[PDB]
Design a protein around this ligand. Structure first.
Ligand SMILES: O=C(NCCc1c[nH]c2ccccc12)OC[C@H]1O[C@@H](n2cnc3c2ncn2ccnc32)[C@H](O)[C@@H]1O
Lengths: 115, 112
């Protein structure tokens, strides 16, 4: 299926409700249901890629697109004091959904280390 | 608006370089927050992700691809976390765009 089998595939296909921020032919941005900051959203590819470790060389511009859409959405949402973008890989990185996704967090001071 | 990362690109100060090509550089972070902690930066001086141009998408993606190939080469088979900080709330420490890659331990939630 277009978008894959994960929960994020179902969001892409409008089978499960989500609070969409932005959508184009390549990606979808929506608020996280378990926010860790005052603003916390995800940007995901519509093409299913399970995790960043298996991304193809030809997936470069798509991955870049996630970050451009992320920074544009942060702007549109009024994160003028800044934000943090996170991609997690595998067990050690902390991945509960195996569909590549960019976390964007802001509206408070983010601390170091980033987990 | 030169930065310390500009000096690193120009080879004017030491850094432990992992990988270089014509448009980016990966090197170990001087202040590591995990057993493995490196940066991937563009050679082009983009001050912060918030000012990246549309035309830069491919380059930003390249940082992530380079980062994931370096992680594999450094033996990070249990996973890793990639981070880009923007602005004071993001805790951006150097005004030259950089991708952090951290692994070699469990990374926690929230991510700061
Ligand atoms: O994979 C990850 N890793 C980060 C967290 C983590 C998990 N395991 C770890 C072990 C260690 C450290 C961190 C972690 O995050 C997936 C994200 O998807 C979010 N999410 C899941 N379902 C929906 C949704 N967001 C909107 N939705 C709308 C409708 N349905 C959903 C979820 O809240 C989470 O932040």
């Amino acid at each position: 299926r277009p978008g894959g089998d994960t929960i994020f595939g179902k969001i892409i296909r409008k089978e499960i409700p989500a609070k969409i921020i932005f959508e184009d032919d390549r990606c979808l941005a929506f608020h996280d249901i378990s926010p860790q900051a005052p603003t916390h959203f995800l940007v995901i590819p519509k093409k299913h890629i399970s995790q960043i470790s298996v991304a193809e060389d030809d997936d470069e511009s798509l991955l870049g697109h996630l970050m451009i859409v992320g920074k544009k959405c942060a702007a549109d949402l009024g994160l003028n004091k800044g934000y943090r973008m996170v991609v997690n890989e595998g067990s050690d990185g902390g991945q509960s959904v195996y569909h590549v996704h960019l976390h964007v967090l802001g509206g408070r001071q983010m601390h170091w280390p980033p987990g």
